[PDB]
């Protein structure tokens, strides 16, 4: 009946809907193969499906409606799409599209979208007039991401210390410097809570590379959005497809003016995998870094924007530095004055036990005025000249402490004043 | 009567089984065929046979019980399966198969399975309600393994000292990193001791790859459990066959909610092996490392999880460095950021004499509060302050005579205390 709602059940609740008909020896199969087998149950008995996903258009012409639940992994399940039917409708990758689905014909080993209904939740006909992305004029970043959730808890420390260091806007194209062992993911996680309890509106997506199995369920539990990664195992092909199509995605819901916010990590992780994709131009650079291969990178990190017109793109990507490695250094060096905003972490601080560890005295953003208001950035300019005379770990010693006894950014304000 | 306790037998005992009946001229042969030609003794006459063995479906479509007594190569006396009996029950590679074997008729070479009494230790019909490997939710580690033997041994120090450093729970990814020459398999003869002694339930196997001859009789005769190794003098294609037949079989016992504990010896000699079998890809890193070849080896190595449903899957491979080759060293670079946790075997504290030689400042394990109580968290801390400060050899020297002090970890804790 819903395609959507079988993938997001769990595969032990699928073995008993596929004995429901009959079907037999389903646990010995994939995920994705016990919904194609039970899509068939369906099909004989002709009920209506409905099933929708995100449409990745391949160099041939005819494409597919890959999952979001499964990374976008190209599975037996995949919706198929008719190279005719992305003419009638314009529609290209990353389009959301949803409608019924009609069984394979035969010679056919998907199943086909037979009436388009709702694309990036719009009408097929309003979508066609729609601005094309790149068309659009940047704009400067001026509406505030309240990171603060309030509650004063101890986890909401963190974010206070995040928006003191770095003011974060939408369409600010963030970016992270983080050593190794200094609580990275652990940061990213709190902002993503922070985001989709904020701000419910933007839409949230959490992209993570070469991560490790466990931390993608740690991060699919915990953020409240859209998660997808793709573990270290998955070839590097699979790293810039999975990064292709969220940034694709992310496009389109800029161009129905809504606002889209892209934690990516990491950066320098993104990039290696892009190397080894890219076949070599000849021209290489120091470490076994392909010069050439880096425009596709930064071509993902140089989308991130504030559009005039509406909505904006907000890409806050974690780089990787003194890891040990060449390459991770040869990556971080060709996005460093790129980013539009900084915030470094400090390995020291982190062997303090002492969270978060923010080099308040090496982060910061531009143009951060046009976020803050008057009042606000002079009293931020204060704690500028305070934090800037001491040390890297005694000032987050400092500064944790005169944040713990107010609750509230505006309440510390006034302490710090007087 | 039974093929697996023939298999067993020592090679000289074969020899009066074989003459027994009167076989002429066994012993200038190998023991796979002794065994075959035993098992024709047995065929002309008509008793009923008993053995086992471990599936391997080839691309043809059927497959070989290979028996771990030999390492799983290709014997002559591997029972055959046809393409439809892996289809009554739904088979695959890795799968424990038990029953009586018929023997070979005109134009069949192989022995062949007449019935399947038991798979992977369960009822044959059982076997196809077990969920799929992938389809579970991997998790972080959460009971810890206690290394510790408690007797106070000199050689429990080894074990002592680990669980101190670097604690280790089910379905931990671990990697230790050794330099030559730190004994290092000394302190794999510990691990695979401790574990086979307190917990005896969860399945340890030992897999040995591009390892001496000598070697592998000497892991055979200490380890409690199944030791399956391959000498250097084997093909490139062997230690990857063997490495793929180890990772199966532990996958299919953590579908039966079964703890399995891998101690691969040595991810540098498994990915070195891979490198060679797999074609090149038009891509190739620095030290003659192909890119897409180590996709294989991180499959191998990604497997290691907790799974939530029930059952865990540890592997501890040991990575080879400041072995004077490139390709050694590319190798660790991508499995550097990958393992749950670190151990560093250090050359200059193996070269001082003192044992075990672990670098304790650079060994450390993730998410370590999961498997520890909330107090001894706080005692390990504790020590990490005294610890830090020290060098690598200093360290490990006052480490070790103060736990020779005590007979236990905790109280250790208590001397150190006050
Ligand atoms: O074609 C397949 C695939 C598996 C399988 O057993 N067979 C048939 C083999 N087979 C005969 O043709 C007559 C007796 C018998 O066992
Ligand atoms: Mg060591």
């Known amino acids: 009946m819903n395609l959507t709602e079988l ?24 995920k994705q193969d016990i919904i194609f087998a039970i899509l ?17 258009i391949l160099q041939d012409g005819f494409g597919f409606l890959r999952s979001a639940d499964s990374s976008y992994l190209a599975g037996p399940d995949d919706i198929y799409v008719s190279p005719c039917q ?3 409708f314009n529609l290209r990758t990353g389009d959301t599209i949803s409608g019924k689905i009609r069984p394979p014909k035969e010679g056919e080993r998907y199943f086909a979208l037979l009436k388009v209904n709702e694309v990036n939740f719009d009408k097929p006909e309003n979508a066609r007039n729609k601005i094309l992305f790149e068309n659009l004029t940047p704009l400067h970043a001026n509406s505030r991401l309240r990171m603060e959730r309030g509650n004063g808890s101890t986890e909401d420390l963190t974010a206070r210390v995040l928006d003191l260091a770095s003011p974060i806007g939408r369409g600010q194209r963030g970016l992270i410097v983080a050593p190794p062992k200094a609580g990275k993911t652990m940061l990213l996680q709190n902002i993503a809570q922070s985001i989709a309890y904020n701000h419910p509106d933007c839409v949230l997506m959490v992209l993570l590379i070469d991560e490790r199995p466990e931390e993608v369920t740690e991060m699919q539990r915990l953020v409240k959005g859209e998660v997808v990664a793709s573990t270290f195992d998955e070839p590097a ?6 990064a292709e199509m969220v940034i694709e995605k992310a496009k389109r819901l800029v161009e129905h003016k809504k606002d889209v916010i892209i934690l ?12 080894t994709v890219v076949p070599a131009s000849g021209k290489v650079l120091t470490g076994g870094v392909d010069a050439n ?9 140089g989308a991130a924007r504030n559009v005039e017109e509406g909505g904006s793109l907000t890409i806050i990507a974690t780089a990787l530095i003194d890891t040990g490695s060449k390459m991770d250094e040869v990556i971080y ?10 915030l470094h972490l400090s390995r020291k601080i982190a062997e303090k036990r002492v969270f978060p560890a923010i080099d308040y005295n090496r982060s910061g953003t531009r143009k951060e005025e046009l976020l803050t208001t008057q009042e606000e950035l002079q009293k931020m300019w204060i704690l500028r000249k305070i934090i800037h005379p001491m040390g890297e770990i005694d000032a987050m010693e400092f500064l944790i402490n005169k944040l713990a006894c107010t609750k509230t950014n505006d309440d510390f304000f006034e302490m710090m004043k007087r």
């Open 293 to 301: 291969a880096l425009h596709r990178p930064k071509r993902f990190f």
């Open 40 to 56: 068939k149950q369906h099909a004989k008995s002709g009920e209506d499906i409905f099933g929708d996903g995100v449409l990745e």
């Open 333 to 342: 060096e060709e996005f460093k004055g790129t980013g539009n905003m900084e």
């Open 237 to 242: 092909s699979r790293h810039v497809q999975v």
């Open 264 to 275: 990516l990590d990491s950066i320098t992780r993104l990039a290696r995998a892009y190397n």
């Open 7 to 30: 993938k997001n059940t769990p595969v032990s609740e699928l073995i008993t809907l596929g004995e429901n008909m009959g079907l037999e020896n389903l646990a010995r199969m994939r």
């Open 86 to 88: 992305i003419r009638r």
